[PDB]
Design a protein around this ligand. Sequence first.
Ligand SMILES: N[C@@H](Cc1ccc(OP(=O)(O)O)cc1)C(=O)O
Length: 297
Amino acid sequence: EMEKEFEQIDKSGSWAAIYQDIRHEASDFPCRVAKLPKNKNRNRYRDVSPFDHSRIKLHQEDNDYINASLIKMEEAQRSYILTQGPLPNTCGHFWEMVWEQKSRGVVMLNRVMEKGSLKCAQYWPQKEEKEMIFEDTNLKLTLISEDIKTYYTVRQLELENLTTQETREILHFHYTTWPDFGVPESPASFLNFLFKVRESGSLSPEHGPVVVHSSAGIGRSGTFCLADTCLLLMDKRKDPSSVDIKKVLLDMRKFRMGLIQTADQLRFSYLAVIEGAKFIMGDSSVQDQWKELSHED
Ligand SMILES: N[C@@H](Cc1ccc(OP(=O)(O)O)cc1)C(=O)O
């Protein structure tokens, strides 16, 4: 059980060590392209890059680079694209990637401004009268409507390939209360938000991979993804005990570096998967409790 392990680590107060071990066993693949001099201004953080093997390639004959990675979870049969918070010169690229990869949803786990600094460009329109047109990638983006809650907002955006005039609806799930390098207020609010994304179809296989991002695209992003895959893995068999969280986090780190930034985010991942397992096991009432506990309205 992950719960027995949880209790053992907790009793022994060894989340730091456990996490140092993950950091030490994590894959290390080259990030040659991320490091090319022509891509310097396309990376927000010097120490956070996409491995070449899993990076998302833009279909432009100019510079196909974007700081984004495809986390392809074989056994769980679910993919996600983790990316950094778009920079002012990479918002067109970001939306280009969304169009090309056929994503239906974008999960934003950070705020534009955090800790007195700009952690991500304002890459989507905050009002409907004012659409965005990314000239470099020939795309148009319009806010259609938004549903603001206490700690998150869900937006319905319309993305148009100005070249073909094809149009797509993109859902934007914005978690506005998760501290950079922190953990959510409670498993309840996080699971409530996670099920909002799930219930939307965004995570479905009929669509391209959902784009998940934070500021670096690894801390809060990794946390979100780890919990989801773990819950999906136990869902296929209705067997929470067959899931090894550390092992799952490690398979994910083969696709992108630094997934889950602190020992507490790791600990929070366990709490979230343990609590979410109640639902997986047939107690669907727990979903209503998360809503309550979340205090979304
Ligand atoms: N380690 C760098 C870059 C970094 C930023 C954010 C971060 O987490 P998040 O993916 O959750 O935005 C991880 C790393 C920083 O501390 O500024």
